[PDB]
Amino acid sequence: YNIADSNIANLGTELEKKVKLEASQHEDAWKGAGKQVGVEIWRIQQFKVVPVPKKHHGSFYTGDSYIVLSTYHPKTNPDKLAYDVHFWLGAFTTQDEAGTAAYKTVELDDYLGGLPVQYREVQGYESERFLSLFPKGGLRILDGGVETGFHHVE
Amino acid sequence: TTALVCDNGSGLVKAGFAGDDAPRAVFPSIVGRPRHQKDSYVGDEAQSKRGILTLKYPIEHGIITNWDDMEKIWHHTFYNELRVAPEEHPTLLTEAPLNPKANREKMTQIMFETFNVPAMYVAIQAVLSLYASGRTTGIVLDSGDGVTHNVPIYEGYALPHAIMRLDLAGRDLTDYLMKILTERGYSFVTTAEREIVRDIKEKLCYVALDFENEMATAASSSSLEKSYELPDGQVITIGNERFRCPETLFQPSFIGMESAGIHETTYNSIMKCDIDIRKDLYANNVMSGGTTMYPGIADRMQKEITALAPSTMKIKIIAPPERKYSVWIGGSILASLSTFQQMWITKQEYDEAGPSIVHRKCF
Ligand SMILES: Nc1ncnc2c1ncn2[C@@H]1O[C@H](COP(=O)(O)OP(=O)(O)O)[C@@H](O)[C@H]1O
Ligand SMILES: [Ca+2]
Ligand SMILES: [Ca+2]
Ligand SMILES: [Mg+2]
Numbered sequence: 001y002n003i004a005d006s007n008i009a010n011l012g013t014e015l016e017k018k019v020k021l022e023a024s025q026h027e028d029a030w031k032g033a034g035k036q037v038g039v040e041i042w043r044i045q046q047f048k049v050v051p052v053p054k055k056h057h058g059s060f061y062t063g064d065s066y067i068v069l070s071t072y073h074p075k076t077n078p079d080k081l082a083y084d085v086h087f088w089l090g091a092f093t094t095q096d097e098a099g100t101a102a103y104k105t106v107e108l109d110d111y112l113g114g115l116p117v118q119y120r121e122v123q124g125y126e127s128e129r130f131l132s133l134f135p136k137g138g139l140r141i142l143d144g145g146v147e148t149g150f151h152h153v154e
Numbered sequence: 155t156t157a158l159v160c161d162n163g164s165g166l167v168k169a170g171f172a173g174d175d176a177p178r179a180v181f182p183s184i185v186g187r188p189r190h191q192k193d194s195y196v197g198d199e200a201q202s203k204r205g206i207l208t209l210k211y212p213i214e215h216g217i218i219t220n221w222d223d224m225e226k227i228w229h230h231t232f233y234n235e236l237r238v239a240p241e242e243h244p245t246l247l248t249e250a251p252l253n254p255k256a257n258r259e260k261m262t263q264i265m266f267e268t269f270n271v272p273a274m275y276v277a278i279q280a281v282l283s284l285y286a287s288g289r290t291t292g293i294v295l296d297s298g299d300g301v302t303h304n305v306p307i308y309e310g311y312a313l314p315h316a317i318m319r320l321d322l323a324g325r326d327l328t329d330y331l332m333k334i335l336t337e338r339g340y341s342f343v344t345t346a347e348r349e350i351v352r353d354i355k356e357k358l359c360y361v362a363l364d365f366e367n368e369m370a371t372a373a374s375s376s377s378l379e380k381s382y383e384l385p386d387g388q389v390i391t392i393g394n395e396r397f398r399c400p401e402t403l404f405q406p407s408f409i410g411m412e413s414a415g416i417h418e419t420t421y422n423s424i425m426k427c428d429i430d431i432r433k434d435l436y437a438n439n440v441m442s443g444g445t446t447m448y449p450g451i452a453d454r455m456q457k458e459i460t461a462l463a464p465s466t467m468k469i470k471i472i473a474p475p476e477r478k479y480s481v482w483i484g485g486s487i488l489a490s491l492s493t494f495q496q497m498w499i500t501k502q503e504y505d506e507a508g509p510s511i512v513h514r515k516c517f
Contacts, residue, residue: 001252003314008251008278009513011314016517023493047173047490065288089288096175098288099487106290106310107493118290118309149490150175 017114024111027104033069034083034112039133040069042104044097046149049104058138062090062123063145065101067108069116070133083116085109086130090141091123094148157495158243159485160231161279162224164213164300165324165444167197168482169231172246172489177482179235182349184209185223196230201349209345215321216250216301217257225264232269240265244273244498246489248481250301251278251312252319258516259509266504273498276516280305281312282484283442287472291431292438295420295455296481297445299324302403302416304423308431316426318419322406324445328352330409331359331399340390354382354392355399361450362397363457365404369394400448404458417458436463440472442480 003009010016024030029042029049041052044065052066060066066088074082085108087101102120109116121130123141131139157172163183170177186200186207187193195203212223232240247261258276265271280294284307293306304318332342332351342351358380362368372378372394379393402408404415414422424435439459441452452473459469474480488494499515507514 001319003252005254006251007249007253007255007258007276007513008312008314008317009255011312011517015514016311019497019515019517023496026493026496047487087290095286095288095483096487096490099285099484100491102285102288102290103310103488103491103494109309120289120291148175149173150486151171151173153170153174153176153178 017110020107020110021113024107027107027111030108030111033108034071034081037071037073037081040071042067043146044100044104045146047096047100049100058134059140059142060088060090060123061142061145063092063094063143065089065093065097067101067105068121068130068133069108070129083112084119084129085116086119086121086127086133088121088126088130089123090145092145094150096148096150100149156243157489158232158236158238158240158245159482159489160228160245161248161282161482161485162213162227163298164211164216165298167227167231167235168479169236170482170486171236172486174486175483176476176479179231181235183213183227184211185220185226186210194226196226197235204346204349207346209349211299211325213300214325215323216298217253218260221260221264225268228264228269241270241272243271244489244495245269245271245275246485246498247274247276248279248282248485249276250296250303250319251280251305251317252303255513258512262499262504262509262512266499266501271501273495273500275494275498276512277485277488278305278312279303279481280442281307282482282488283477283480284440284484285487286442286480286484287440287474289438289440291434292440292472293420293424293435294440294442295416295446296442297323297403297416298443299445302419302445304420306423306427306431306435308427308434313427316423318423320406320413320416320419322402322409322411322413323443324352324355326409327359327399327402327445328355330402331355331395334395334398335390335392338390338392338395350384356444356447358382358392359396359399359448361400361403361448361454363450363454365397365401368397400451403445403451404454415458417455417462420455421459421462433468436467436469438472439470440474440480442474442477444478446473446477 168177181197
């Protein structure tokens with residue numbers, strides 16, 4: 001059409017990035033994230049981003065959705081940090097959980113200045129990078145999961 | 155505080171509450187007035203009384219063209235359907251991409267100045283559908299009653315240079331079915347008859363995998379024919395109209411448009427994106443909206459995109475069963491997130507900035 005006359009005239013702009021960066025400041029889960037090399041994991045629980053304790057990292061409920069931030073030193077500089085952000089979608093996760101995990105992955109990306117590379121990891125379709133995150137035998141799928149945040153309209 | 159999510163389709167209002175898994179109110183986006191020239195009726199009641207009314211849609215091709223009647227639609231949604239006080243509810247609205255800027259400016263003005271909402275946001279429909287599918291990267295084909303749009307999205311950001319739009323969707327297909335049914339000697343002309351034909355289309359139409367083969371099948375025997383009982387009790391029969399009607403999506407020249415069909419436009423949108431992301435778009439074509447509900451459409455899209463794309467390209471069409479509601483559902487999810495709501499326009503911000511603020515907050 002004529003993009004400039006339209007409701008998408010400001011897509012792709014610095015302004016769009018600025019507004020979304022500000023929104024990402026209002027999620028407590030990101031405070032302190034990505035500050036050292038390692039893996040940080042959160043689970044979506046009724047729309048909220050909830051930390052997974054380190055002792056459970058690598059075990060994932062098949063009924064749930066998760067965000068996994070892998071912080072590492074890039075080849076270009078052994079003293080600075082780069083990021084892969086994976087969102088893991090269990091085979092039985094509900095639509096609210098997967099949609100929140102996707103949205104909040106983008107938000108964590110925003111919070112980290114756009115630097116993370118995003119990976120969608122459906123159970124049974126996990127990328128080679130995702131498989132490499134956990135020590136031998138470390139990736140374990142657990143039965144069940146937390147209840148959906150949706151109210152079911154009858 | 156519960157947000158309201160209202161997806162104002164060209165054809166149907168889908169409205170309800172953030173955090174619900176489906177819209178609680180779904181009804182025709184129509185105002186009816188006496189066909190012989192309270193004094194008006196809205197929604198389901200207009201439909202129920204269409205024997206005596208002329209029906210008008212305030213939204214045409216995704217754009218509000220009758221603001222007074224659109225206000226009646228919104229008033230009906232809040233007060234008669236959902237039975238809420240709009241001044242108590244932050245409200246999420248939706249729009250097709252590539253609409254003129256003034257459309258959302260006036261949406262914003264009416265929501266704050268007439269309905270006194272405490273906060274609001276206007277989202278692009280295809281973006282909501284992608285999140286409803288659990289993705290941050292993919293290309294959405296959204297087709298309702300007014301607009302067919304293609305939006306490629308990478309890592310959560312829509313790529314504006316590659317967005318496509320066709321003002322050809324369900325209402326044009328209904329009108330075409332009305333036209334071609336005259337070949338059988340049927341006469342569907344009035345606004346009430348348009349609604350009958352819309353129902354015929356929804357119940358009996360399908361997309362042929364190979365259009366020319368299907369035309370030959372239809373002439374060889376009656377195997378593809380179906381019957382349909384009109385509201386007056388007359389039973390009609392339709393044959394190749396079942397698949398000629400939606401063929402128009404692939405061949406817009408059926409209605410005299412020179413446009414590329416929906417397969418070619420999807421391909422063209424992908425081809426406007428950086429080469430290194432195209433494989434991810436081809437593997438993540440997500441369909442949303444009622445006009446994507448024809449039986450056979452996903453298989454036809456798969457076939458046509460395969461013929462256009464490089465011979466080794468992995469192509470996948472994702473066609474969620476609830477895709478008549480995917481936009482609404484994505485809105486329900488995002489409006490349940492406090493950080494998404496942090497971006498919404500507040501009443502105070504509107505009072506100080508006016509309608510222009512919508513372009514600085516809603517992306
Ligand atoms: N099963 C179906 N087959 C074909 N078209 C359909 C079907 N169901 C709904 N539609 C069409 O989809 C449109 C309504 O879908 P919807 O996504 O709510 O549109 P909008 O958002 O524009 O109101 C109408 O044109 C309707 O006739
Ligand atoms: Ca769950
Ligand atoms: Ca990024
Ligand atoms: Mg729609």
